[PDB]
């Protein structure tokens, strides 16, 4: 069934690669799909390739599988991952401002403190806060990087340039996007927080229970909510920014392989899906959190035939990412 050419960013992502080739080649017959690995240092450059035809398939965040549907790489996404269990799938997260108990401020405090985001562009570590921040954010608020530089006393943003926008970095020197920078991602901005760098971490609702297992280490740590209030960890349904679609597995338009991709996902996922095999797992991995997939997904949805990017995110959340990088006080 053809080989699809997986887009791995840095080394930790290329090991387990290398590791999902062996593995579904060594329970897969000649006949079923097989897996390549190319490497890249940025989901960008992956990005770029698949356009290129250099490479078939990557796992985007929702805020980036927009940014790659626009021209001129017009991707689409082909495969969603769903969380919560099988018995009842979600395609959808939450996103959360996550803080050290008793560091005494509120959302509508945040500014002059140190955040800490899973990546520039990401929905629940960019779009999502930064879009209910954007008023408070000082002006002139474009470019928003330097808007965002300016309101916090020092970030993360993994990605960003931090040649023209310095203090986005102050947190994880040269802004690196892949997991070579350890504050990168959802447990990268959350060991951010942790480490003491900063004061509050943009991620989903289940970065902390991915990095703490005890429940009197998660009791140190709370949640920002609308109200301007705070609330437990395990409160989020009740104390969250927004939801926000699931991360996608994006491909070409013409050529794509879409019908592949989601053989080779959908035969892996009974392979080494949740709790599947003690040999290899998609969605874990001794090398890593989130590489190629989230952690937290419990397996792979198809996407509706021919489906775009817009249609697929929803009208809600693409007016938020439209809003934000628009949008007036
Ligand atoms: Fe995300
Ligand atoms: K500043």
Same mark, same amino acid.
């Given at each position: ?10 080394? /930790? ?5 290398? *590791? ?13 799909? *097989?897996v390549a690995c190319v490497k890249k240092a940025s989901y960008l450059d #992956? ?7 250099? %490479? ?46 008793? +560091? ?30 954007? #008023? ?69 609702? +289940? ?34 920014? %927004? ?17 592949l991709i989601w053989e080779l996902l959908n035969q892996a996922q009974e ?15 001794? /090398? ?7 952690? +937290?997904? /419990? ?31």
């Amino acid at each position: 069934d053809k080989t699809v050419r997986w887009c791995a960013v840095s080394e /930790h992502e290329a090991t387990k690669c290398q *590791s999902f080739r062996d593995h579904m080649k060594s329970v897969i017959p000649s006949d079923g799909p *097989s897996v390549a690995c190319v490497k890249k240092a940025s989901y960008l450059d #992956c990005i770029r390739a698949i356009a290129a035809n250099e %490479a078939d398939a990557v796992t985007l965040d929702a805020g980036l599988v927009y940014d790659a549907y626009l021209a001129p790489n017009n991707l689409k996404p082909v495969v969603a991952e769903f969380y919560g269990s099988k018995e009842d799938p979600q395609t959808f997260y939450y996103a959360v401002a996550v803080v050290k108990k008793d +560091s005494g401020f509120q959302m509508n405090q945040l500014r002059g403190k140190k955040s800490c985001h899973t990546g520039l562009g990401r929905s629940a570590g960019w779009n999502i806060p930064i879009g209910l921040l954007y #008023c408070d954010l000082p002006e002139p608020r474009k470019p928003l990087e330097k808007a965002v530089a300016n309101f916090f006393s020092g970030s993360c943003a993994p990605c960003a340039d931090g040649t023209d926008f310095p203090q986005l970095c102050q947190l994880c020197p040269g802004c690196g996007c892949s997991t070579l920078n350890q504050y990168f991602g959802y447990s990268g901005a959350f060991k951010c927080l942790k480490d003491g760098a900063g004061d509050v971490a943009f991620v989903k609702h +289940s970065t902390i229970f991915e990095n703490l297992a005890n429940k009197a280490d998660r009791d140190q740590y709370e949640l920002l909510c609308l109200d301007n209030t705070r609330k437990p960890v395990d409160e989020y349904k009740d104390c969250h920014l %927004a939801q926000v679609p699931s991360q996608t597995v994006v491909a070409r338009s013409m050529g794509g392989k879409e019908d592949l991709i989601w053989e080779l996902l959908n035969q892996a996922q009974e392979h080494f899906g949740k709790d599947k095999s003690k040999e290899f797992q998609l969605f874990s991995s001794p /090398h890593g959190k989130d590489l190629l997939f989230k952690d +937290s997904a /419990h397996g792979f949805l198809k996407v509706p035939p021919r489906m775009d990017a817009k249609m697929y995110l929803g009208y809600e959340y693409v007016t938020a990412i439209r809003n934000l990088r628009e949008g007036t006080c």
